[PDB]
């Protein structure tokens, strides 16, 4: 179609670039600049809105296709095929394409404003700076390709259930938890600090798990999903919590989007993260809340996911 | 006898709530409320002075009970049999009944002082109602049974050598190790975070090691190491930290402990619990002293060990 | 020679303390005494001046004398052979005779100042105090034949490479890691934190790659790199960061010290250090510096690595 035609002639530009980018660096895991979480959280609610607008079957391709890539990585910076390049910068586009303009443009406002100005240089300096001018040379075609095809308006927001098994034990669960919920502190910088000996490839292929279980999922139940973040977002107090409401509304939403996809998709999720998590890193969490509150709140997720397994 | 044909009573009563209570709740590591250390040593130390009063033979026995039970449990929540239920409760009820009553409602009304009142129902929201309600209907018809056989005085003290190998190396160990005492945060909730990557089963074979030893050991050093607590308590400062006087008579009575079991039943205990103490624990540990204070403990515990395995 | 045959009227009076010592005690670690890294990076600025005038073929023999000496241990209290102990202090009077003799009390001094008066006694009380006064006197008669060939002036210094491929890189290296270089406590006490779960003797295994690795680089290098250290001591701020070009110097002398040693031998040190290293080392020391200045560091050091990979 258009923008696969499109996306050819940007790898043309763009895959030189790909190739000397360096993309096992951990400066990704990393804010562009410093950390400003509330500030940040502006920038992904643009994000959380613009994916609730978009097609759900574009969305799905779309994460297909990075699962594709990721299958494909060669070398010692961690690059895709060339094939792939081009085949997850086509998927993008026609998402971007399903989304207004102005829905677009706010994520780079918002997220241009927490990066630092100084970032683009940097990454520059890490490649050949002839190869980077041509790569964005040719995302500027790219764009205006994406901009012909790209629709006028937002489609309309996703239903949601009121009183499925689902929705009422996550009334209990979110009850039981909202007291851990509460004392989390969610403007700490300590869930960006790496995992204690996982590479970055080894961490991509426990994220694979969940890219692959994206692409399962319903896309209603995940537009609603994302519609409730949103709505948990606007109100958060000072300390970033969202209202018990808006919680529950989110772990409702979650557990349907679990119950979309088979218990192996999910297991599959567990497991590669069991891999990669060391065990410490609960421990710390923990240490840090009330833990009559953390136990709890775990207690209460056992039970929510009897209810969310026998949906599923 | 009596009390074990009580106790097949209270199972017919109490073994259906048994069977629903979640024994691997992670809750149970935790106070029953807000940690209050000092309070709780009060609680504690009622528990020792009425361990001191018991039978030998019957704490021996009612250890023994645990390790039987121990072996015996399967399922989700981690329950015991039915018939080593209830070989717990009756050999419990026999330890119960060789103390005075007054020496039993210490223990309960210092336990209730640091027990948030909103435990019970917590603990019964978690269970079926009815099942919990006639548990403890079989419980008060159980402690009737026990209260006719309850003894009316205390047995007395027991017998303490003085000058023997251990009790003047246990001297050294003591001058050497009081400074490193004295720096550990005795009123801390760190002993209550949680072993990272063990499960409560695992847990458990590991305490299973310790309640064995405990059911070898002669029971009248027994006795004489829980006298020595008790007196220890007695002369805490304002941060918890017992006097060195008292401190070198509890290194004496635990050495005793160790000698009067073979070293196999020692090892056996340190090999389990270096099966589930992650190597952060010790070094957490040591972070928070003077590292020159741990080391002149530590050097000061490997000589005198080497006194306590001649002993033995 | 001389000093050999000395070595062993050395060893027949020392022998015997050095059997006693429990070489594998964890307080050798720490300082001996309080520790105050300002005044103990004076003492060390003392050794460096003084290896920096050694002989470096005796140096070498001296490193290979301790490679040899941690392969002959045997006991619970770490002791190598009689004939390495006579072996190792052959060596060490050798190199002690190569530099002038105000050098080596400037080190007597230096570390006397940062010796808590108290640890000489401590020491010898863990030990029988004949042997220790046995072995001190034949210190004492050891050294008098040491003096008597010893220099009277020292050495000249080292040439000083300039423009090769890895001074060059050296620079690169250094501009962008020196904020990081920043922000690390050099005053703190973690660096003397043991390594969970590492036992002396595992420890003292990964150590002797280092020694090996010394034995075989380049003397000429090595005496570069530490007159380079020299320099950096003197330039140090209130919180002991040098200044920006004495690092760059010392990365330079750093990378030629590495190239001046096979791949193997680089290899063996780091798969041992690798596997004494618990995974959350690292961890705790990014996090205490900016995230993004350590990755800039870590990122130009696989760069630089390169060019010493190159000339090595
Ligand atoms: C249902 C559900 O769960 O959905 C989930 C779905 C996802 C996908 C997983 C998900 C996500 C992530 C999302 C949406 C990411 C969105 C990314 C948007 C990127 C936008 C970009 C780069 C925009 C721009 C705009 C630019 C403008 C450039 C210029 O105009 C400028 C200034 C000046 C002009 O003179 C010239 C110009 C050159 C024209 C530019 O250069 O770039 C999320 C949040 O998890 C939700
Ligand atoms: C650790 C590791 O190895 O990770 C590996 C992971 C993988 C996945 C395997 C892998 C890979 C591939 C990757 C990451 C590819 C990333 C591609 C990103 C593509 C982004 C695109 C196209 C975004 C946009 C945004 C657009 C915006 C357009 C507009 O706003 C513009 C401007 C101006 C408006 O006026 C009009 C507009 C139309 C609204 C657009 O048109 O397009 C790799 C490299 O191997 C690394
Ligand atoms: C199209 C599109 O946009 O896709 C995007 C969609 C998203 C959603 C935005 C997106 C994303 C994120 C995704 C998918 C996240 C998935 C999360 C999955 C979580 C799964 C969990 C917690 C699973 C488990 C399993 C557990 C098991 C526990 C037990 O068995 C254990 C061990 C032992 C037993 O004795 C007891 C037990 C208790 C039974 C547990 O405790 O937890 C992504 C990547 O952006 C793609
Ligand atoms: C910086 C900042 O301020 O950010 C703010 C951002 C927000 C969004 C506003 C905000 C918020 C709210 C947040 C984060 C809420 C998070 C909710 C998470 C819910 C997750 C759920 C339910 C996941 C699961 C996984 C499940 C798995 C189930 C199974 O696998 C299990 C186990 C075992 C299998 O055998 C069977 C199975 C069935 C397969 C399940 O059943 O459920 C907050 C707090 O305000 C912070
Ligand atoms: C570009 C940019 O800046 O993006 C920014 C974007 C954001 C969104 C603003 C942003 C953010 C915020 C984020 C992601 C927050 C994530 C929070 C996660 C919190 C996780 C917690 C608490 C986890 C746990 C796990 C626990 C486990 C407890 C137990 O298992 C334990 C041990 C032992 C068992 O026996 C009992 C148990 C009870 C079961 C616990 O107790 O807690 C950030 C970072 O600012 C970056
Ligand atoms: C030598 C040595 O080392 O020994 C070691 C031995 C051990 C065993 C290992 C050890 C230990 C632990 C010990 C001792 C534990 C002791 C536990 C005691 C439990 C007591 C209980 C539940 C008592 C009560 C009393 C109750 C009263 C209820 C009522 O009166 C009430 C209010 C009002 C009335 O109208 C009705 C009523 C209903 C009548 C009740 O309901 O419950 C220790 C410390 O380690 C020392
Ligand atoms: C993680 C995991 O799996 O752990 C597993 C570990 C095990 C061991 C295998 C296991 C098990 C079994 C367990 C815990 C059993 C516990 C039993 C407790 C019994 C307690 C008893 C009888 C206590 C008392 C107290 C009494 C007090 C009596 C009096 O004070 C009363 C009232 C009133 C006074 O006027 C008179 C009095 C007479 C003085 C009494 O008469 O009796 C299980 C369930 O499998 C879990
Ligand atoms: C009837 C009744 O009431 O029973 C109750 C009685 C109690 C007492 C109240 C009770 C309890 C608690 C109990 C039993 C606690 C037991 C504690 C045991 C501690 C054992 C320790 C530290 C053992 C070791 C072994 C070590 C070995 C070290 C070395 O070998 C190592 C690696 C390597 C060698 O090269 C050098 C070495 C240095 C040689 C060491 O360093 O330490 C309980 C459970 O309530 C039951
Ligand atoms: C909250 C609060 O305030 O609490 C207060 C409570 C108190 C009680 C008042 C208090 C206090 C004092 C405390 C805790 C003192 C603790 C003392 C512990 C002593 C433990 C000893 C000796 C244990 C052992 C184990 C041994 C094992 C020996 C062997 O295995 C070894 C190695 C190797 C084998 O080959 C041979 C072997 C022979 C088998 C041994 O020889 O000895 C304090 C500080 O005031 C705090
Ligand atoms: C190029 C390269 O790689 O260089 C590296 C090489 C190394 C080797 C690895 C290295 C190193 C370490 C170095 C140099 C260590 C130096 C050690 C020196 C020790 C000196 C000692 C013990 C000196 C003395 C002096 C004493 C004096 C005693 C008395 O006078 C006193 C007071 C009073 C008199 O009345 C009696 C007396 C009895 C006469 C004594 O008793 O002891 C470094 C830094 O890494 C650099
Ligand atoms: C964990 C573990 O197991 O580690 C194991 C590691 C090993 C390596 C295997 C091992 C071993 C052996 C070891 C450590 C041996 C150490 C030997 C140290 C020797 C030091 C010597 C000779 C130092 C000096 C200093 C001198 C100074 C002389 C003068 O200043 C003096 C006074 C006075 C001036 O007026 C004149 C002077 C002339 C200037 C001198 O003449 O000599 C062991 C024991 O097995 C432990
Ligand atoms: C004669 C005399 O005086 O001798 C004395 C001389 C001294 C110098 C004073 C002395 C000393 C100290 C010494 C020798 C120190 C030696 C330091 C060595 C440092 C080596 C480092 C960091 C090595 C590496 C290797 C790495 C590998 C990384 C990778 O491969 C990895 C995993 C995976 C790939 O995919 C990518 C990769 C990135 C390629 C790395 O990242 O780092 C001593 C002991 O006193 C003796
Ligand atoms: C207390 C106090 O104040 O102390 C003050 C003390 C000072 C000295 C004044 C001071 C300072 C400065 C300091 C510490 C600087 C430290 C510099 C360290 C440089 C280390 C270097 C370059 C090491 C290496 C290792 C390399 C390995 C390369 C390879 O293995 C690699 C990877 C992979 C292989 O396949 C190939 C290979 C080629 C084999 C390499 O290429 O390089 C400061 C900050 O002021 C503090």
């Known amino acids: 179609d258009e923008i696969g035609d499109a996306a050819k002639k940007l790898g043309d530009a763009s895959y030189a670039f790909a190739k000397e980018v360096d993309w096992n660096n951990g400066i990704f895991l990393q804010a562009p600049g410093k950390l400003q979480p509330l500030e940040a959280l502006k920038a992904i ?61 706010d994520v780079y406002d918002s997220v241009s404003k927490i990066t630092d100005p100084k970032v683009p240089a940097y990454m520059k300096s890490l490649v050949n700076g002839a190869d980077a001018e041509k790569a964005y040379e040719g995302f500027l075609a790219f764009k205006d390709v994406v901009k012909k095809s790209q629709v006028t308006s937002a489609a309309g927001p996703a239903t949601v259930p009121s009183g499925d098994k689902i929705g009422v034990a996550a009334q209990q669960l979110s009850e039981a938890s909202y007291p851990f919920l509460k004392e989390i502190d969610w403007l700490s910088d300590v869930y960006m600090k790496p995992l204690p000996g996982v590479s970055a490839q080894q961490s991509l292929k426990a994220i694979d798990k969940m890219i692959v279980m994206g692409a399962q999922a319903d896309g209603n139940a995940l537009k609603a999903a994302a519609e409730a973040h949103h709505k948990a977002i606007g109100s958060i107090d000072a300390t970033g919590v969202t209202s018990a409401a808006d919680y529950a509304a989110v772990n409702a939403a979650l557990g349907r989007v679990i119950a979309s996809v088979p218990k192996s998709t999910v297991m599959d999720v567990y497991n590669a993260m069991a891999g990669v998590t060391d065990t410490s890193i609960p421990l710390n969490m923990f240490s840090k809340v009330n833990p009559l509150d953390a136990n709890a709140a775990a207690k209460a997720f056992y039970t929510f996911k009897d209810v969310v397994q026998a949906a599923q």
Chains 1, 2, 3 share one sequence.
């Open 45 to 105: 609610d643009k994000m959380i809105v613009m994916g609730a607008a978009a097609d759900p079957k574009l969305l799905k391709a779309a994460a297909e296709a990075h699962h594709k890539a990721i299958g494909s990585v060669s070398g010692p910076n961690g690059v895709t095929s060339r094939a792939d390049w081009d085949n997850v910068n086509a998927a993008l586009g026609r998402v971007i394409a399903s989304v207004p303009e102005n829905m677009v443009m």
